[PDB]
Amino acid sequence: TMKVINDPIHGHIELHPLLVRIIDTPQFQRLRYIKQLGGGYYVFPGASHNRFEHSLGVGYLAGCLVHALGEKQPELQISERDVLCVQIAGLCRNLGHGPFSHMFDGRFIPLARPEVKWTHEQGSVMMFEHLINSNGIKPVMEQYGLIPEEDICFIKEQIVGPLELWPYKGRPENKSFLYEIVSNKRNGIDVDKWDYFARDCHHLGIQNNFDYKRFIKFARVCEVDNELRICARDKEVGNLYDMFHTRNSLHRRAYQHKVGNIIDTMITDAFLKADDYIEITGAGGKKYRISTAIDDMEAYTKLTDNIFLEILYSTDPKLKDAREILKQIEYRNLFKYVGETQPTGQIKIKREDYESLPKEVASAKPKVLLDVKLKAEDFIVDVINMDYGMQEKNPIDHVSFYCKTAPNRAIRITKNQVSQLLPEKFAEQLIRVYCKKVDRKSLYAARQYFVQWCADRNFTKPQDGDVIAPLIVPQKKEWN
Amino acid sequence: TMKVINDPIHGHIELHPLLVRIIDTPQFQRLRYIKQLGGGYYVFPGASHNRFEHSLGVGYLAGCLVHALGEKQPELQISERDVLCVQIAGLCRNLGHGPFSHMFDGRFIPLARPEVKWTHEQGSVMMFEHLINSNGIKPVMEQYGLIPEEDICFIKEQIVGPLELWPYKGRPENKSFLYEIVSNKRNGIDVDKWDYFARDCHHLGIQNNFDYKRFIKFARVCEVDNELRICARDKEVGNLYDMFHTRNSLHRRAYQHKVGNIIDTMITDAFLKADDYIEITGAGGKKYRISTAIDDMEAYTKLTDNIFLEILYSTDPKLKDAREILKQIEYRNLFKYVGETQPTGQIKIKREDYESLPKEVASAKPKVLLDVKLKAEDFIVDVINMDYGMQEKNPIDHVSFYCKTAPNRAIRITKNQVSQLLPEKFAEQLIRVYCKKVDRKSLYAARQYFVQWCADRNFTKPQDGDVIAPLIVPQKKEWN
Amino acid sequence: TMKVINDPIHGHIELHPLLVRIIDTPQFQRLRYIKQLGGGYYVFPGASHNRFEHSLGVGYLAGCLVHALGEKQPELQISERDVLCVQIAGLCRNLGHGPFSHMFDGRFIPLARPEVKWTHEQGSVMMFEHLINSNGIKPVMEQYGLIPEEDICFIKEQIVGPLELWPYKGRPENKSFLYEIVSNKRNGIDVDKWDYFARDCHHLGIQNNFDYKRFIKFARVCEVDNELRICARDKEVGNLYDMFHTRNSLHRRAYQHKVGNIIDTMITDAFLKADDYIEITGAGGKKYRISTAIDDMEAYTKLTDNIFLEILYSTDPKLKDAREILKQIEYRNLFKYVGETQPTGQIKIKREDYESLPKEVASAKPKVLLDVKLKAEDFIVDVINMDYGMQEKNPIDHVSFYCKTAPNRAIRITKNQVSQLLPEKFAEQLIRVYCKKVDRKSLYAARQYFVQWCADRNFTKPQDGDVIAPLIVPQKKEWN
Amino acid sequence: TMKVINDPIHGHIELHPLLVRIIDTPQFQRLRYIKQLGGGYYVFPGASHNRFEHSLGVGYLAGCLVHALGEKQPELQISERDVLCVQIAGLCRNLGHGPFSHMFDGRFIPLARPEVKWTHEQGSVMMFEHLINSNGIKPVMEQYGLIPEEDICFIKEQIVGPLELWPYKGRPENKSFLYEIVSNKRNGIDVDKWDYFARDCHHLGIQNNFDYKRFIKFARVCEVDNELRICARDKEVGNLYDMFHTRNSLHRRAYQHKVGNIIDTMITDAFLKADDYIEITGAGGKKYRISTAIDDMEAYTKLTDNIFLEILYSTDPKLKDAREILKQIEYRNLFKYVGETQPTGQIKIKREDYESLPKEVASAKPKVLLDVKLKAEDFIVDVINMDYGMQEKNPIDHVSFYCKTAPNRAIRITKNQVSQLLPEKFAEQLIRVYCKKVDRKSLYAARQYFVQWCADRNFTKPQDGDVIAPLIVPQKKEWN
Ligand SMILES: Nc1nc2c(ncn2[C@H]2C[C@H](O)[C@@H](COP(=O)(O)OP(=O)(O)OP(=O)(O)O)O2)c(=O)[nH]1
Ligand SMILES: Nc1nc2c(ncn2[C@H]2C[C@H](O)[C@@H](COP(=O)(O)OP(=O)(O)OP(=O)(O)O)O2)c(=O)[nH]1
Ligand SMILES: Nc1nc2c(ncn2[C@H]2C[C@H](O)[C@@H](COP(=O)(O)OP(=O)(O)OP(=O)(O)O)O2)c(=O)[nH]1
Ligand SMILES: Nc1nc2c(ncn2[C@H]2C[C@H](O)[C@@H](COP(=O)(O)OP(=O)(O)OP(=O)(O)O)O2)c(=O)[nH]1
Ligand SMILES: [Mg+2]
Ligand SMILES: [Mg+2]
Ligand SMILES: [Mg+2]
Ligand SMILES: [Mg+2]
């Protein structure tokens, strides 16, 4: 009442007792045991940080922004009840994360449970509900002036969007700007991003191109289309674009690091192999698989990065195959990266097609002499979609600006007004190919398959293609 | 033996005694009295740093890179003599800078001496010669194993390019890579840039996305077209593009800051007004103007940021007009910024046309009722060319890469291979308009003139145009 | 060739392949799963870093120092074989650490196994041997020019001192300075400290008073008493004292943080409760307790922070008591801190007396009316010894200096020469008292017991004593 | 409304328009032309920062603390008028500084004008009055709710203490805590210190021992002796001591750097030589010396670091001696540092003492064979007093603390309660000796004079004494 926590990114963070009550629960504390960057820690030893510290940061920044708007614009009638709700959403948006974070909902669940559609945000809402009910938080909310029925809705809406005009039941259109702060559905500019840019750079040893503190200073609320929305100062438009650039740097350099991804792939492989044999106790003593733990929050509370070690230390013969894979990670005996390429023209690769791609690479017949012949099962093909968070769309088209001369009047800024250099399209795809067989002979073969395949599909020439496949590259005139 | 200097960017820098001898001279120490960012200090109070500290940083980094290549590749046969020559060029490349740095050669000299063609690099070569001769350095160079005739040529060549087939007399083609380090004519990737990105961000409070230390680690020398050149690792290509992005961020945010530029303009105005009256004593007691001090290095040694204060504290009635302008800077009564716009389509603006542009803006007739009428003299129009340092050209097309699989074999990477998102053209122009009359009524008028002019010229719509000129904007269809 | 690892403290670290081979093993990778600061992470959310990253840092710095001495002093005849051996010791010095680091050897093992005398360094030597033998490293050592018999001895000796005139068989007296780098028995000034000062501050959000990079620049090897030792430049003496100040600041603020220590205590409690029931498989399928895992390295490889979760998620009724304690940690239902005090005059507290101390506090009869009566079992008393690493001794008396005027002649600098302000003794004791019963009534009682006990024992007055025990404090004249 | 300034230490600083009006004046802007660390810049190239940026930082922090207290304790009845007054005092505390900062009032004025007693704080008060009157600020103060008569008094009192039972007319005793923030007379803990610790380390490349942000969080106002005073939390006592430690590190390492001080001395020498010949115009066209410029604020406004260059570029024969000294600085031909020593026992050196000391060193007869004989005029002796800002006194004895258990009740914490290690006395004296004759023969002689003198006076043995005076050191038994 009220507690101070020291954060290496933000310094000294003040937390309201209600917030601290939420934090001090198994459901929140679970976050301590999940790595923010998953397998990236294996590539970047600095990235040891967990979801928990990030969540504090997100909660803190959400507080900063909402308070700043209140001081600048008292007419907005922001209340402490409003501030706490926004901060709670900030703290709890990452609650739903599974072991190794994005690996879990990004790779494992889709392969393990194709029938189901699941996301960590869906998990965060379920976990939040479980957190409140199991630990008697509603009385505490009431004690500090929150109205649980309205406010819990409001918190969940911030995390996951409308639960099903104005589509939100948590707050009226008058308070629309509040929905922008923690997870920005409209344009993706939100405090969650700011904390992780700063936190990940700090731990990775990389550097950030976006200043979040500056953005808060120049933020204003203006009426847009009978909605009150956060508006950025016109000057700051370049800085917004920088934010997205920074995001893409990080994703290319770290989140989508080629080796880091392969490790995530291998961990997923082990999980699939262990999935039937692992048993996690849920509410009522019911037993769940790693894949089905998402169905019961009590089970899910106990599901964390720890599973990795549980599998690794297991003596059970049923788990032997899963155990071997993790062991290969420890020895650094990884699947081998062959190459990266890009689709040409307007072509994009559909999700359905992903399964067929390894077969496609094996099918290519390079015009070369090969000692050994690879198989579709031997290859791994990873497709990565890089974008400004709106897929093809430009997020800044969806941002609102104001000018120094008339702060109250919102305006729109087109891409042409900022720069002619900026891209026509804001999304592109990367294709990475790996070979499961690591022998020198197998690797040489894989390169030939890969470069031929790139040529066959009219994909962009690999950068090292001249060196890895000198015989294959001359055949394609376009490559020269 | 070695002196150690502590640098906030680089930590502890070791300097060879020969280097220290060069540093401890009037000509080098002059750099202490010239602000790195000129008028930017008035916008950014952190940017108090001077050319001197930057030069040390450049010298140090040059040493780092050349040493690294020597340790990695002893076959290159790099010698200490080579190392010292590269470092001396690094230290002395900024020697030529005038008061307020780029303002002096960027703005003042062109207006004061249109007939002459001058650059600070020209000045650095002249100043270096003067430094060596006045302080008896050549014996010291010999004492440490340098051959002055060959080496002084080599140093000057690094600073300013060939002094007029291999075009350099300082070193043979086998040593070509050395010419890449301090000033890179071919692609602009050099240590001078790296130090200032780091140093300027540190002092400004901004942050950058280029890691120079990483670049050194991955640098290699490979044969390219019967030349030995520094080559980047293929992976690092994204980081190279990031370096240029970072450079553009800095330029937009700081080097070309709208208010900082206006102050530079005002300072230049004062210099022009004072130019006839100020006298600087040169060799033999000859007297020079601020504008002609570049002709005599002895005069130029004494020409620094100090001139600004000399004018400001002057009691001479002849200097009164110049003095007033500087006084207005102190009071913060500055010329007022009206707007920024961009040319469209094919159109580009030639240097010769610059004089014409203020008259053009006055000539526009808005079609809105105006209390007051402005004149060409009233306006200032500043044209800024933003590029990747190669004008229209893409610098990465002029970079050489190597691959992990064959470190010795250099390769070329096209833009398509890196990204589809990257720009088709790498240069653009910004037009900024300022009004000399600062009253509210004049400022309103200037905006109308400006927006109408943009419409007339088919320039891009100003971002705040709707707010500043609501009546003018509807007329242009293209702006809707 | 060399692998590069990016470290947020050190930037880009180059690792020799022999080093990488050692790193990529279960035994080394185990370090990924042990928190550097143990329970401190629960107090400091930034301190998520593990032993693994710290070990890389130690290895890197060891390399730096040895290389620097080689470059500065070729006459020392340092070899690559020497460099690799020093680096291997640096990397493997932390190999022996148990779950939660110092908690394990600091608290758990002494309570669980009073008969045995054990330290993590002893463990590191055993683990290193196990690592080499299990993974066939000796051939690899031979391949890179190491002599395993001589060099393995050398490595172990650096870690743990002489394995039992010159007492070391790993290297002769001419190479004595090498033994100073990784673990300094004489002074405690070593690279292991430097990395953790920088790494812990970075993660904790604290700041560091010692510059290790500067120290390396000014380090020299000189003959001292017929031994070659690393010597500091005379100027740097103040910085050395600062290093120790920094160490103390960290220890009081973070390593010995009152809440962090209590968490470590609780975790230890849980371990003791679980010890009989947990079974860890060792070599030959033998089964070990948490306490006995140190006897078998195969068992020990699998013993990590993971145990904490294993206990927490356990359904076994035998583990219920242990499980509850960890659950209380999650809810933040911790033992409560009562006060800190210091012994006065001659007095110091012997290790044997520690068992007695809780009873002593319960025995005190404060002159205040108490509704509830506490028992010896209710109290926890923690005795912490704070010193400059030499107990009562001043470490700088055991440092050798050289002067700019004669860099080869070692000299000695007394405390009086540096400062009159420096402490007469370099060691002191802190006593912290906690209450296991957390109710408000119990806590009030515990404070009265504690302050009375301080008065009885003639200990220093608690800082908050006037407020927590207003009735007790007037009785002691010395306090009033 | 608010202007935003970007500060590398503090990030984005909001400034009230009233504050901006004050800032945008010749009197404030003058601070841009005075180096914070004076001659230190010549030793540390990073330390290019000026008083101006520091002042903004002080103003900003003052605002932070006063706002924080208001939010935490509304009962205090702090008003915007109060906040602005405190900020104005923060901004203007450094207004009085002369060229090269402490050199000017520390060295030059005492030598030039021994009759007068002057400090920069006196200057700041005079300058502030001049700033307000010349630029018509009072109406602006009135416009924003200040009462000039009361508030100007309040501002001056904060800067310089009582202008002549409650001694202040600017605010009543209930508002006593406000006087603590900008300049703390009673204990020296104030925002001015916090900004410079952070700013100087950042520029220097050194690092901080004190967290100011944390201190603000834990600051509270409590009644002490019928006064309301800022009180620190009991826990933070160690950190307070650390703040003073940090201050001493900086002073020994940088502010009192031996070479930096000598440069300051040389600059002072030049000033004294130039003093009669330089003329600075004052109000009404009156002419002043450098030494008498402090008498007229109009003259003083134009007196800055620029003077150094004015002397250096002067052609006047009268200035030739002054000019030569500055030229010697450029060439790095400095007076040579001989040694440092300390007085022993109770002995202390009085200010009157200083003039005699060079003669005393010349008088010593080492009786070692000497080629040359030095004279009193040849030596320079610099006496430096290092303390916790209270001379002999412990500042923490003059701090007030509160406890978590009773936040409203202030308490006192004695040195014995924090640590037994802390010193009994908090002040010590350093004596540095320099020789004006730089030749090798002269330098050897000076060392002998110096070490003999240390022996004669029973001063502490110099650290390098054994090496510099091997014959002299054996004579003193106490040293051996
Ligand atoms: N930077 C810094 N952080 C600290 C220091 N001491 C503690 N911390 C960190 C640890 C926590 O994340 C945060 C708050 O810790 P505290 O020690 O102030 O809280 P604690 O609950 O132990 O004390 P309290 O309950 O108020 O008596 O600050 C310090 O001296 N410096
Ligand atoms: N600071 C920084 N670190 C990076 C970047 N990319 C990777 N790293 C880190 C991750 C690793 O700790 C270390 C080396 O990563 P690399 O991708 O350069 O090595 P990798 O083995 O993946 O590639 P290679 O075997 O050289 O093809 O540097 C980057 O752009 N910036
Ligand atoms: N978990 C935990 N860690 C501690 C404690 N005391 C110190 N540490 C941490 C601080 C450093 O990050 C690390 C240093 O341990 P090492 O075995 O590497 O060095 P050593 O034990 O010699 O510590 P020292 O040299 O005295 O700092 O241990 C403690 O009570 N608990
Ligand atoms: N970190 C950072 N600082 C900036 C940037 N642009 C400007 N600054 C600094 C320079 C100043 O100290 C401060 C404010 O400069 P601005 O350009 O934001 O204000 P200005 O008065 O020029 O614009 P205004 O009159 O409000 O339209 O922030 C930026 O993009 N990043
Ligand atoms: Mg020196
Ligand atoms: Mg690799
Ligand atoms: Mg402005
Ligand atoms: Mg002070």
mmCIF file of N, CA and C in Angstrom, chain B residues 29-42 47-53 97-105 264 267 271 278 280 290 299-313 326, chain D residues 32-33 35 41 48 50 304-306 309-310 313:
data_model
loop_
_atom_site.group_PDB
_atom_site.id
_atom_site.type_symbol
_atom_site.label_atom_id
_atom_site.label_comp_id
_atom_site.label_asym_id
_atom_site.label_seq_id
_atom_site.Cartn_x
_atom_site.Cartn_y
_atom_site.Cartn_z
ATOM 1 N N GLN B 29 43.900 20.864 -31.571
ATOM 2 C CA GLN B 29 43.193 21.305 -30.383
ATOM 3 C C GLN B 29 42.100 22.296 -30.755
ATOM 4 N N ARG B 30 42.238 22.918 -31.931
ATOM 5 C CA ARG B 30 41.230 23.803 -32.468
ATOM 6 C C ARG B 30 39.885 23.127 -32.508
ATOM 7 N N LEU B 31 39.916 21.816 -32.735
ATOM 8 C CA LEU B 31 38.698 21.015 -32.821
ATOM 9 C C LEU B 31 37.883 20.980 -31.530
ATOM 10 N N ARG B 32 38.528 21.292 -30.420
ATOM 11 C CA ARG B 32 37.823 21.411 -29.161
ATOM 12 C C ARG B 32 36.790 22.529 -29.158
ATOM 13 N N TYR B 33 36.980 23.521 -30.016
ATOM 14 C CA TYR B 33 36.172 24.719 -29.990
ATOM 15 C C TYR B 33 35.148 24.763 -31.106
ATOM 16 N N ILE B 34 34.862 23.626 -31.732
ATOM 17 C CA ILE B 34 33.855 23.572 -32.795
ATOM 18 C C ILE B 34 32.825 22.516 -32.472
ATOM 19 N N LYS B 35 31.565 22.926 -32.367
ATOM 20 C CA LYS B 35 30.490 22.015 -32.014
ATOM 21 C C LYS B 35 30.283 21.046 -33.147
ATOM 22 N N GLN B 36 30.165 19.788 -32.790
ATOM 23 C CA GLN B 36 29.876 18.752 -33.752
ATOM 24 C C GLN B 36 28.560 19.009 -34.494
ATOM 25 N N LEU B 37 27.509 19.389 -33.767
ATOM 26 C CA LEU B 37 26.190 19.524 -34.357
ATOM 27 C C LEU B 37 25.753 20.959 -34.561
ATOM 28 N N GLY B 38 26.667 21.909 -34.395
ATOM 29 C CA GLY B 38 26.384 23.296 -34.744
ATOM 30 C C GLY B 38 25.228 23.872 -33.938
ATOM 31 N N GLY B 39 24.241 24.394 -34.654
ATOM 32 C CA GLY B 39 23.046 24.954 -34.072
ATOM 33 C C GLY B 39 22.143 23.952 -33.389
ATOM 34 N N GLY B 40 22.350 22.667 -33.656
ATOM 35 C CA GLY B 40 21.581 21.608 -32.999
ATOM 36 C C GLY B 40 21.653 21.641 -31.491
ATOM 37 N N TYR B 41 22.768 22.130 -30.962
ATOM 38 C CA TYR B 41 22.930 22.287 -29.533
ATOM 39 C C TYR B 41 21.836 23.176 -28.938
ATOM 40 N N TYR B 42 21.410 24.174 -29.703
ATOM 41 C CA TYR B 42 20.310 25.071 -29.287
ATOM 42 C C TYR B 42 18.961 24.366 -29.235
ATOM 43 N N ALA B 47 23.671 17.826 -26.936
ATOM 44 C CA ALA B 47 24.651 17.865 -28.013
ATOM 45 C C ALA B 47 25.637 18.995 -27.832
ATOM 46 N N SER B 48 26.368 18.972 -26.739
ATOM 47 C CA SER B 48 27.420 19.928 -26.461
ATOM 48 C C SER B 48 28.805 19.461 -26.960
ATOM 49 N N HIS B 49 28.878 18.263 -27.507
ATOM 50 C CA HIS B 49 30.151 17.709 -27.904
ATOM 51 C C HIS B 49 30.785 18.401 -29.101
ATOM 52 N N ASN B 50 32.108 18.326 -29.157
ATOM 53 C CA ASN B 50 32.881 19.000 -30.164
ATOM 54 C C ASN B 50 33.556 18.048 -31.110
ATOM 55 N N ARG B 51 34.114 18.597 -32.176
ATOM 56 C CA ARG B 51 34.754 17.783 -33.205
ATOM 57 C C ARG B 51 35.945 16.978 -32.677
ATOM 58 N N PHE B 52 36.602 17.529 -31.676
ATOM 59 C CA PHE B 52 37.793 16.936 -31.131
ATOM 60 C C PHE B 52 37.579 15.519 -30.588
ATOM 61 N N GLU B 53 36.536 15.350 -29.800
ATOM 62 C CA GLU B 53 36.236 14.060 -29.191
ATOM 63 C C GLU B 53 35.798 13.083 -30.250
ATOM 64 N N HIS B 97 37.146 21.301 -40.507
ATOM 65 C CA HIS B 97 35.810 21.839 -40.178
ATOM 66 C C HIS B 97 35.860 23.261 -39.708
ATOM 67 N N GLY B 98 34.862 24.036 -40.131
ATOM 68 C CA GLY B 98 34.752 25.444 -39.778
ATOM 69 C C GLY B 98 33.802 25.652 -38.627
ATOM 70 N N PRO B 99 33.588 26.928 -38.224
ATOM 71 C CA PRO B 99 32.705 27.145 -37.078
ATOM 72 C C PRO B 99 31.308 26.588 -37.296
ATOM 73 N N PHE B 100 30.808 25.855 -36.305
ATOM 74 C CA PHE B 100 29.495 25.247 -36.369
ATOM 75 C C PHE B 100 29.450 24.140 -37.420
ATOM 76 N N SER B 101 30.615 23.615 -37.786
ATOM 77 C CA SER B 101 30.698 22.464 -38.656
ATOM 78 C C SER B 101 30.001 22.680 -39.996
ATOM 79 N N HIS B 102 28.994 21.873 -40.306
ATOM 80 C CA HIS B 102 28.474 21.809 -41.658
ATOM 81 C C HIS B 102 27.789 23.108 -42.088
ATOM 82 N N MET B 103 27.377 23.913 -41.118
ATOM 83 C CA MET B 103 26.834 25.213 -41.417
ATOM 84 C C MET B 103 27.831 26.015 -42.242
ATOM 85 N N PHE B 104 29.099 25.928 -41.871
ATOM 86 C CA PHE B 104 30.131 26.759 -42.454
ATOM 87 C C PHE B 104 30.367 26.452 -43.939
ATOM 88 N N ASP B 105 30.576 25.179 -44.251
ATOM 89 C CA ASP B 105 30.751 24.782 -45.651
ATOM 90 C C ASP B 105 29.405 24.495 -46.314
ATOM 91 N N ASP B 264 20.819 27.787 -37.653
ATOM 92 C CA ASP B 264 22.003 27.764 -38.494
ATOM 93 C C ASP B 264 21.906 28.828 -39.550
ATOM 94 N N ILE B 267 22.496 32.190 -37.938
ATOM 95 C CA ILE B 267 23.898 32.361 -37.601
ATOM 96 C C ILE B 267 24.664 32.720 -38.855
ATOM 97 N N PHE B 271 26.883 36.042 -39.857
ATOM 98 C CA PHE B 271 28.244 35.940 -40.356
ATOM 99 C C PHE B 271 28.424 36.770 -41.595
ATOM 100 N N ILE B 278 34.877 41.879 -39.724
ATOM 101 C CA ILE B 278 35.782 41.035 -38.926
ATOM 102 C C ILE B 278 37.123 40.869 -39.624
ATOM 103 N N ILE B 280 40.801 38.631 -39.337
ATOM 104 C CA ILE B 280 41.558 37.559 -38.727
ATOM 105 C C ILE B 280 42.987 37.561 -39.261
ATOM 106 N N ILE B 290 36.181 36.319 -42.501
ATOM 107 C CA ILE B 290 35.697 35.009 -42.094
ATOM 108 C C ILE B 290 35.657 34.137 -43.335
ATOM 109 N N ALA B 299 45.432 31.650 -40.377
ATOM 110 C CA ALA B 299 44.208 32.369 -40.048
ATOM 111 C C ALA B 299 43.122 31.387 -39.619
ATOM 112 N N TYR B 300 43.028 30.273 -40.342
ATOM 113 C CA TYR B 300 41.961 29.333 -40.146
ATOM 114 C C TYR B 300 42.066 28.639 -38.788
ATOM 115 N N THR B 301 43.285 28.482 -38.287
ATOM 116 C CA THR B 301 43.505 27.875 -36.980
ATOM 117 C C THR B 301 42.757 28.612 -35.903
ATOM 118 N N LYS B 302 42.666 29.926 -36.045
ATOM 119 C CA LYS B 302 42.008 30.773 -35.043
ATOM 120 C C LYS B 302 40.525 30.954 -35.311
ATOM 121 N N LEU B 303 39.986 30.359 -36.370
ATOM 122 C CA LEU B 303 38.577 30.548 -36.692
ATOM 123 C C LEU B 303 37.730 29.402 -36.179
ATOM 124 N N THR B 304 36.846 29.693 -35.236
ATOM 125 C CA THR B 304 36.092 28.657 -34.509
ATOM 126 C C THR B 304 34.743 29.192 -34.088
ATOM 127 N N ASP B 305 34.017 28.419 -33.288
ATOM 128 C CA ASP B 305 32.690 28.825 -32.809
ATOM 129 C C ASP B 305 32.750 30.104 -32.026
ATOM 130 N N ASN B 306 33.934 30.399 -31.516
ATOM 131 C CA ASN B 306 34.171 31.608 -30.780
ATOM 132 C C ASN B 306 33.724 32.873 -31.488
ATOM 133 N N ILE B 307 33.746 32.850 -32.817
ATOM 134 C CA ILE B 307 33.375 34.022 -33.605
ATOM 135 C C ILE B 307 31.978 34.471 -33.237
ATOM 136 N N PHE B 308 31.126 33.505 -32.955
ATOM 137 C CA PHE B 308 29.760 33.784 -32.579
ATOM 138 C C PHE B 308 29.711 34.682 -31.362
ATOM 139 N N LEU B 309 30.498 34.352 -30.350
ATOM 140 C CA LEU B 309 30.541 35.177 -29.140
ATOM 141 C C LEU B 309 31.256 36.504 -29.375
ATOM 142 N N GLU B 310 32.255 36.492 -30.247
ATOM 143 C CA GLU B 310 32.986 37.701 -30.578
ATOM 144 C C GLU B 310 32.019 38.727 -31.166
ATOM 145 N N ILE B 311 31.146 38.279 -32.056
ATOM 146 C CA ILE B 311 30.154 39.150 -32.673
ATOM 147 C C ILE B 311 29.142 39.597 -31.649
ATOM 148 N N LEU B 312 28.710 38.666 -30.820
ATOM 149 C CA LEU B 312 27.669 38.953 -29.827
ATOM 150 C C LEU B 312 28.085 39.983 -28.789
ATOM 151 N N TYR B 313 29.337 39.924 -28.345
ATOM 152 C CA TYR B 313 29.830 40.863 -27.342
ATOM 153 C C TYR B 313 30.404 42.137 -27.972
ATOM 154 N N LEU B 326 22.074 37.640 -33.561
ATOM 155 C CA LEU B 326 22.495 36.699 -32.519
ATOM 156 C C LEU B 326 21.729 36.959 -31.239
ATOM 157 N N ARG D 32 25.184 28.438 -21.346
ATOM 158 C CA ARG D 32 25.593 27.577 -22.437
ATOM 159 C C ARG D 32 27.089 27.665 -22.738
ATOM 160 N N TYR D 33 27.714 28.759 -22.338
ATOM 161 C CA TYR D 33 29.085 29.009 -22.688
ATOM 162 C C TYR D 33 30.037 28.807 -21.540
ATOM 163 N N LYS D 35 31.751 25.732 -19.171
ATOM 164 C CA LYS D 35 31.938 24.303 -18.988
ATOM 165 C C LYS D 35 31.650 23.921 -17.560
ATOM 166 N N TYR D 41 37.668 19.027 -18.905
ATOM 167 C CA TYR D 41 37.428 18.702 -20.293
ATOM 168 C C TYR D 41 38.729 18.385 -21.019
ATOM 169 N N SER D 48 32.309 17.701 -22.142
ATOM 170 C CA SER D 48 32.105 18.934 -22.894
ATOM 171 C C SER D 48 30.852 19.697 -22.443
ATOM 172 N N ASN D 50 27.911 21.821 -20.448
ATOM 173 C CA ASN D 50 27.921 23.147 -19.872
ATOM 174 C C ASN D 50 26.942 23.290 -18.740
ATOM 175 N N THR D 304 32.516 34.704 -19.845
ATOM 176 C CA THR D 304 32.321 33.276 -20.033
ATOM 177 C C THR D 304 33.622 32.626 -20.436
ATOM 178 N N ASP D 305 33.554 31.353 -20.782
ATOM 179 C CA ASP D 305 34.744 30.601 -21.185
ATOM 180 C C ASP D 305 35.411 31.200 -22.407
ATOM 181 N N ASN D 306 34.647 31.969 -23.165
ATOM 182 C CA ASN D 306 35.123 32.661 -24.351
ATOM 183 C C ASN D 306 36.355 33.474 -24.095
ATOM 184 N N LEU D 309 39.660 31.938 -25.165
ATOM 185 C CA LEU D 309 40.007 32.084 -26.577
ATOM 186 C C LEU D 309 40.369 33.531 -26.944
ATOM 187 N N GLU D 310 39.718 34.487 -26.299
ATOM 188 C CA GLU D 310 39.990 35.874 -26.572
ATOM 189 C C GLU D 310 41.456 36.150 -26.251
ATOM 190 N N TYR D 313 43.890 34.241 -28.840
ATOM 191 C CA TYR D 313 43.999 34.804 -30.181
ATOM 192 C C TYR D 313 44.457 36.261 -30.153
#
